[PDB]
Amino acid sequence: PSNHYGPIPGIPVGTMWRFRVQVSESGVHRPHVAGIHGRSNDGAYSLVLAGGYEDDVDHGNFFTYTGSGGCDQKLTNTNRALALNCFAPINDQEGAEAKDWRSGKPVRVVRNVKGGKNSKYAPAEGNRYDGIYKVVKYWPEKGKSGFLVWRYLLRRDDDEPGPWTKEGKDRIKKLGLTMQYPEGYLEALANAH
Numbered sequence: 001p002s003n004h005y006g007p008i009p010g011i012p013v014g015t016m017w018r019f020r021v022q023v024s025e026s027g028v029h030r031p032h033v034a035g036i037h038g039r040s041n042d043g044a045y046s047l048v049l050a051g052g053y054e055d056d057v058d059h060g061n062f063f064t065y066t067g068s069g070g071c072d073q074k075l076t077n078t079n080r081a082l083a084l085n086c087f088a089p090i091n092d093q094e095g096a097e098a099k100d101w102r103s104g105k106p107v108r109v110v111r112n113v114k115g116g117k118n119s120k121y122a123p124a125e126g127n128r129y130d131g132i133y134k135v136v137k138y139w140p141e142k143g144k145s146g147f148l149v150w151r152y153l154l155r156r157d158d159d160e161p162g163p164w165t166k167e168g169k170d171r172i173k174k175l176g177l178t179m180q181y182p183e184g185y186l187e188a189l190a191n192a193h
């Protein structure tokens with residue numbers, strides 16, 4: 001259903017879609033605009049990396065991430081959902097750290113092209129599912145705007161190899177994974193002259 005944790009059965013690491021709407025219908029990331037999917041009384045099930053905040057670093061197996069809202073950010077809505085994934089008691093004043101971070105709730109992570117400029121791992125086209133990550137720690141700090149922002153550190157915890165790795169490339173080749181286009185899209189662009 002909508003609140004399903006973990007990988008979508010039948011959708012392996014390395015699957016690519018050209019548009020966010022295809023990512024929504026696959027179930028990997030259900031919101032078609034919002035960069036994160038979750039519930040404040042539950043966890044976060046998926047998020048997309050598409051640039052956003054320049055202080056975020058993306059290094060493949062680990063990356064930093066900045067929350068949403070709002071003025072100061074609050075540990076509400078999806079900010080709390082992502083925090084609740086961290087294997088630590090929720091703390092909206094100083095953040096928390098999971099000593100046993102692999103026991104936290106999984107997050108499906110897709111990256112989008114517009115994150116390209118401060119991430120060498122963003123795909124050149126469309127969206128790519130990169131596997132399960134886990135919330136290592138989260139903390140509040142003063143952002144570039146001068147207000148408060150909630151930051152997160154996540155790390156990869158997936159049985160399938162990262163798609164950029166040699167072994168992940170072999171799986172993409174062996175599975176036949178290719179850029180998915182909506183039916184008729186390429187045909188409509190070519191007849192438009």
Ligand SMILES: O=C(CCCCCCC(=O)Nc1c[nH]c(=O)[nH]c1=O)NO
Binds near residue numbers: 061062102155156157
């Ligand atoms: O870069 C990667 C992929 C390869 C890391 C896999 C094994 C290394 C590791 O297990 N080290 C750990 C250190 N400290 C912890 O607390 N827990 C750990 O599990 N990370 O996802």
